Amino acid sequence: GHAADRIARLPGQPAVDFDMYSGYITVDEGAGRSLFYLLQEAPEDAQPAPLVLWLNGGPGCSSVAYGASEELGAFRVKPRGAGLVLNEYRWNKVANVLFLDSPAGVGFSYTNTSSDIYTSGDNRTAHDSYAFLAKWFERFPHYKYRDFYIAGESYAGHYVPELSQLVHRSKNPVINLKGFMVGNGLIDDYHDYVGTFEFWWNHGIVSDDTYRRLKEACLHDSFIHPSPACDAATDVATAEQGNIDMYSLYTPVCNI
Amino acid sequence: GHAADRIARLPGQPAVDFDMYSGYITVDEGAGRSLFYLLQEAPEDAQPAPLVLWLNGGPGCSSVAYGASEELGAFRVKPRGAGLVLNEYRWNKVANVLFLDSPAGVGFSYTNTSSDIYTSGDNRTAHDSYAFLAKWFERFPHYKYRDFYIAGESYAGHYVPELSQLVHRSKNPVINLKGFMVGNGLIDDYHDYVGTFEFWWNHGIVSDDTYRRLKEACLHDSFIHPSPACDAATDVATAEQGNIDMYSLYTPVCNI
Amino acid sequence: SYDPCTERYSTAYYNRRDVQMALHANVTGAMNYTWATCSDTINTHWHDAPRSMLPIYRELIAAGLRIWVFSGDTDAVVPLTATRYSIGALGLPTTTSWYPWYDDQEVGGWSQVYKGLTLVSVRGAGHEVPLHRPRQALVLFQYFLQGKPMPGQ
Amino acid sequence: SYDPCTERYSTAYYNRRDVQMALHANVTGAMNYTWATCSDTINTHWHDAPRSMLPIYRELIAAGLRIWVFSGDTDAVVPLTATRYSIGALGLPTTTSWYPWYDDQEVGGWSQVYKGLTLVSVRGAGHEVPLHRPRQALVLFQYFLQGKPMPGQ
Numbered sequence: 019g020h021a022a023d024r025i026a027r028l029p030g031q032p033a034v035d036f037d038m039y040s041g042y043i044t045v046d047e048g049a050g051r052s053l054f055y056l057l058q059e060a061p062e063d064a065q066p067a068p069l070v071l072w073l074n075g076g077p078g079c080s081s082v083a084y085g086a087s088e089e090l091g092a093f094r095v096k097p098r099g100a101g102l103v104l105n106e107y108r109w110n111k112v113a114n115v116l117f118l119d120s121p122a123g124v125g126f127s128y129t130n131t132s133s134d135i136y137t138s139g140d141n142r143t144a145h146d147s148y149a150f151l152a153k154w155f156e157r158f159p160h161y162k163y164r165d166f167y168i169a170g171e172s173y174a175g176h177y178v179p180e181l182s183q184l185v186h187r188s189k190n191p192v193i194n195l196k197g198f199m200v201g202n203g204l205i206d207d208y209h210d211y212v213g214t215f216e217f218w219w220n221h222g223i224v225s226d227d228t229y230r231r232l233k234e235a236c237l238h239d240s241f242i243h244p245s246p247a248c249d250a251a252t253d254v255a256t257a258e259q260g261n262i263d264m265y266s267l268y269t270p271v272c273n274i
Numbered sequence: 275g276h277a278a279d280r281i282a283r284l285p286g287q288p289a290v291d292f293d294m295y296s297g298y299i300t301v302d303e304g305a306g307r308s309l310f311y312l313l314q315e316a317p318e319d320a321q322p323a324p325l326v327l328w329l330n331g332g333p334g335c336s337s338v339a340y341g342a343s344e345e346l347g348a349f350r351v352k353p354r355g356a357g358l359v360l361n362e363y364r365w366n367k368v369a370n371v372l373f374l375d376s377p378a379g380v381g382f383s384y385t386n387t388s389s390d391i392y393t394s395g396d397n398r399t400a401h402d403s404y405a406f407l408a409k410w411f412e413r414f415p416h417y418k419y420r421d422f423y424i425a426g427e428s429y430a431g432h433y434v435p436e437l438s439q440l441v442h443r444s445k446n447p448v449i450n451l452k453g454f455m456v457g458n459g460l461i462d463d464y465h466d467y468v469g470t471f472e473f474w475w476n477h478g479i480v481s482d483d484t485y486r487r488l489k490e491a492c493l494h495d496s497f498i499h500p501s502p503a504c505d506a507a508t509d510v511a512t513a514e515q516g517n518i519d520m521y522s523l524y525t526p527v528c529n530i
Numbered sequence: 531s532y533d534p535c536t537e538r539y540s541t542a543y544y545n546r547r548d549v550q551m552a553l554h555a556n557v558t559g560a561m562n563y564t565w566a567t568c569s570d571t572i573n574t575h576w577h578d579a580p581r582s583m584l585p586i587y588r589e590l591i592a593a594g595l596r597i598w599v600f601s602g603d604t605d606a607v608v609p610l611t612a613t614r615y616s617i618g619a620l621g622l623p624t625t626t627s628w629y630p631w632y633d634d635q636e637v638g639g640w641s642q643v644y645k646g647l648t649l650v651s652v653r654g655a656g657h658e659v660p661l662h663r664p665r666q667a668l669v670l671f672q673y674f675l676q677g678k679p680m681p682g683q
Numbered sequence: 684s685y686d687p688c689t690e691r692y693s694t695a696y697y698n699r700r701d702v703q704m705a706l707h708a709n710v711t712g713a714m715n716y717t718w719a720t721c722s723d724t725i726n727t728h729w730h731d732a733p734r735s736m737l738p739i740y741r742e743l744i745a746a747g748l749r750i751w752v753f754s755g756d757t758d759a760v761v762p763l764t765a766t767r768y769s770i771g772a773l774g775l776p777t778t779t780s781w782y783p784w785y786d787d788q789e790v791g792g793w794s795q796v797y798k799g800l801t802l803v804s805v806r807g808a809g810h811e812v813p814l815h816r817p818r819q820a821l822v823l824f825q826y827f828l829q830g831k832p833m834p835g836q
């Protein structure tokens with residue numbers, strides 16, 4: 019029932035010319051894992067536009083929270099979470115964007131098996147996303163065969179290509195995957211670490227010594243599972259960095 | 275006659291609580307070389323404050339034009355050069371700032387010997403500045419013995435320390451040189467080139483190949499007198515750079 | 531205009547009963563925890579994560595899919611240089627060397643086209659590109675969708 | 684607020700008869716050329732320029748003078764990295780390693796104190812520091828004048 023997922027109007031939402039749907043798809047029956055999605059469609063005049071699955075990283079962060087609410091989503095939230103404003107550059111001006119909270123336990127997505135939240139990993143995250151997709155298409159059969167893309171940021175540099183491969187290999191005929199796009203994403207741990215430190219040093223954010231220490235401490239590690247040498251090194255970097263937003267070097271930090 | 279150099283009020287200048295003087299000092303009698311200066315004093319409540327000689331680079335650029343008018347100087351010019359506004363963070367809130375147009379031929383400074391403008395160099399620029407200083411102090415004998423600093427930017431990374439050494443070595447007792455300060459300045463050609471290219475690459479402004487070409491082409495050259503390999507390499511960098519302000523990477527270029 | 535406290539607002543908003551209702555979420559009210567932008571626990575209890583995505587890229591490029599990689603050049607968390615070296619490791623050939631792309635008359639960032647993949651930087655944007663450079667972000671997405679290189683002047 | 688066309692204004696202004704008069708400049712009107720922010724000719728006909736200022740720094744440090752070097756970290760003409768490697772070549776010992784300095788509650792840039800010299804970066808400022816980060820620029824100058832390290836929180 020895609021119709022049941024249709025949203026009428028969100029609280030404080032301005033009026034728009036496009037539709038949106040949101041709800042759940044069960045990805046693991048045994049476990050009781052179900053992912054929540056939010057679909058923001060393009061307006062009529064742009065239809066039939068592609069379908070783009072958008073994924074945030076973390077791991078453990080919500081596509082709805084980020085992607086949809088402070089990034090490419092149709093709206094932005096008011097202060098105090100009072101209401102919404104329209105994002106004049108929403109990507110749904112040109113595509114049907116599907117935001118997925120994942121894996122289960124993130125955002126509005128949930129698991130009936132408690133331990134699921136202590137055992138999350140890339141493989142399962144991907145297989146469940148795959149499940150989610152096949153099922154979503156059954157629920158939205160008018161999307162079958164639509165040109166389809168998968169996109170995301172940061173930790174999603176793992177999610178995207180991983181899910182992409184699964185889709186590609188699965189050979190599901192109703193899913194017309196045409197490609198993927200990754201923003202500031204993890205691609206290769208080693209190279210990434212190397213580039214990261216170099217960038218920092220070239221942005222005057224760590225000392226010469228800490229630059230070197232980081233290179234020596236983290237080079238053989240994963241970005242997501244650093245060694246203790248790596249963390250010790252990063253702890254110093256962090257102190258050197260001070261109170262800035264590492265996610266945006268020249269913009270202010272939130273005061274509240 | 276320091277009194278004769280006193281400025282009453284500049285056109286469109288707002289009212290202020292500090293004095294300013296400007297005029298000429300002859301640095302080379304034979305040649306007919308005379309440098310123009312602009313002194314913006316600190317207010318009474320901050321006196322007797324240090325004396326700071328401020329120098330812009332180029333080489334061939336004016337301390338009055340830059341330093342005094344779009345940087346640390348007391349005022350900023352209105353559009354169309356209509357008038358002035360006060361610079362709320364003028365350095366003359368805390369020091370007596372002396373801006374020097376140099377060498378002769380720059381800004382309002384002049385030479386009676388035409389060829390002077392084709393033969394300028396660091397040594398002469400420094401010796402003349404030295405001359406200028408000794409003479410300026412005679413004209414402003416209440417500045418003798420004041421704590422004195424020399425500061426500047428970019429090509430002035432040459433000017434400052436060069437003039438500083440002359441002063442230091444000269445052993446002029448009325449000049450109480452306490453130190454110098456250099457902003458974004460040339461310090462060592464080789465290291466500078468190396469850091470420059472690295473920074474560019476880390477700011478996504480040139481290709482990998484051009485990065486390498488620059489390193490190979492310019493490393494043994496002077497910043498101010500690059501080899502033809504160096505220029506050829508930089509020509510490409512420039513094309514890669516596009517229409518940005520290299521002097522401020524994230525700010526807009528002037529449209530008029 | 532830019533407001534760094536956005537997560538604060540969202541958290542407020544999504545925690546509203548009315549919103550969940552409209553979204554059809556936490557329907558039976560059985561998610562006993564307040565909504566958060568991320569899950570700490572999961573964040574801190576992550577398991578498998580291959581070190582390199584490269585082989586996948588290799589595969590998919592062979593498979594002929596469209597692959598674009600982008601980077602807000604003022605992010606320090608997963609910075610441009612990181613991406614540059616990573617893509618660099620694929621050793622792909624270049625079809626169009628690093629060039630400035632424009633949005634209007636302003637340089638929106640830079641781009642390099644390789645055989646099989648497009649790399650694009652977004653000038654002055656942090657980690658969350660569509661947040662810091664929303665206009666440029668949209669141009670980027672439109673071209674990607676079209677499979678067209680980022681535009682010159 | 685920031686206006687990149689400043690040179691345009693200055694040129695206009697300084698070329699005014701009234702201004703020159705007030706400045707006591709071009710007094711006899713004998714400088715037959717219009718005033719410019721720089722001299723091209725000189726710029727293009729420069730002579731001697733040692734490759735390194737280091738030896739002077741060495742000397743003056745020995746002489747015990749106060750030496751501060753700063754850098755607006757968004758300048759690409761004589762960028763921070765350039766300075767970092769250059770100062771690096773002096774091999775001085777460090778007294779206070781790279782640390783964030785504050786203006787108020789915001790990080791104004793970073794600083795490192797060596798034996799004999801202070802290095803300071805000015806966050807988000809281009810080539811002309813007092814133009815792009817005027818407030819921070821002033822703090823920087825005050826400390827320098829005082830011979831005091833840039834301040835922590």
Ligand SMILES: *[C@@H]1O[C@H](CO)[C@@H](O[C@H]2O[C@H](CO)[C@@H](O)[C@H](O)[C@@H]2NC(C)=O)[C@H](O[C@@H]2O[C@@H](C)[C@@H](O)[C@@H](O)[C@@H]2O)[C@H]1NC(C)=O
Nearest residue numbers: 043044045046047048049050051052129130557558559560
């Ligand atoms: C996770 O656990 C919940 C309790 O079982 C359950 O909520 C319902 O579960 C079953 C079926 O899967 C429902 O038939 C029961 O009524 C039950 N109780 C509630 C709170 O309704 C979750 O099931 C999901 O929620 C229900 C509202 C309903 O839509 C189910 O059919 C639905 O899948 C169960 N979630 C799973 C397994 O994904």
Ligand SMILES: *[C@@H]1O[C@H](CO)[C@@H](O[C@H]2O[C@H](CO)[C@@H](O)[C@H](O)[C@@H]2NC(C)=O)[C@H](O[C@@H]2O[C@@H](C)[C@@H](O)[C@@H](O)[C@@H]2O)[C@H]1NC(C)=O
Nearest residue numbers: 299300301302303304305306307308385386710711712713
């Ligand atoms: C450069 O050449 C100018 C012509 O000689 C001269 O202007 C004056 O020069 C002499 C003396 O140095 C004056 O006495 C003459 O009147 C002459 N003509 C003019 C235009 O007045 C520059 O001299 C400088 O300008 C004068 C106004 C005066 O103040 C001079 O005494 C002054 O130094 C001469 N400049 C030099 C040598 O620096």
Ligand SMILES: *[C@@H]1O[C@H](CO)[C@@H](O[C@@H]2O[C@@H](CO)[C@@H](O)[C@H](O)[C@@H]2NC(C)=O)[C@H](O)[C@H]1NC(C)=O
Nearest residue numbers: 126544545547556558559560561562563564565
């Ligand atoms: C699901 O729904 C629960 C009931 O509406 C909700 O409980 C609320 O908890 C928080 C919101 O997190 C608080 O604002 C209220 O005191 C509610 N009271 C109850 C019944 O516990 C719970 O948080 C919701 N789950 C989410 C948001 O994931």
Ligand SMILES: *[C@@H]1O[C@H](CO)[C@@H](O[C@@H]2O[C@@H](CO)[C@@H](O)[C@H](O)[C@@H]2NC(C)=O)[C@H](O)[C@H]1NC(C)=O
Nearest residue numbers: 382697698700709711712713714715716717718
């Ligand atoms: C010195 O003074 C000259 C006369 O006032 C001045 O000439 C003017 O030239 C320009 C200004 O550059 C123009 O605005 C006028 O037509 C003036 N006419 C003359 C007499 O040539 C000259 O430029 C001034 N020199 C400077 C500014 O360095």
Ligand SMILES: O=C(O)C[C@@H](Cc1ccccc1)C(=O)O
Nearest residue numbers: 074075076079084171172173174
């Ligand atoms: O994978 C990441 O790096 C974090 C993840 C969520 C996030 C975005 C911005 C700020 C904080 C957190 C993302 O980037 O989508």
Ligand SMILES: O=C(O)C[C@@H](Cc1ccccc1)C(=O)O
Nearest residue numbers: 330331332335340427428429430
């Ligand atoms: O020595 C330099 O690099 C140039 C010189 C004048 C200038 C400043 C800013 C922009 C253009 C020109 C200076 O920096 O003072």
Ligand SMILES: *[C@@H]1O[C@H](CO)[C@@H](O)[C@H](O)[C@H]1NC(C)=O
Nearest residue numbers: 140141142143144145146578
């Ligand atoms: C990946 O996950 C799927 C689903 O959980 C599993 O069946 C498959 O064997 C997994 N591969 C692994 C864990 O290596």
Ligand SMILES: *[C@@H]1O[C@H](CO)[C@@H](O)[C@H](O)[C@H]1NC(C)=O
Nearest residue numbers: 396397398399400401402731
């Ligand atoms: C430097 O310049 C002064 C003054 O022009 C000159 O007397 C001295 O010999 C010069 N040294 C050089 C040119 O090496």
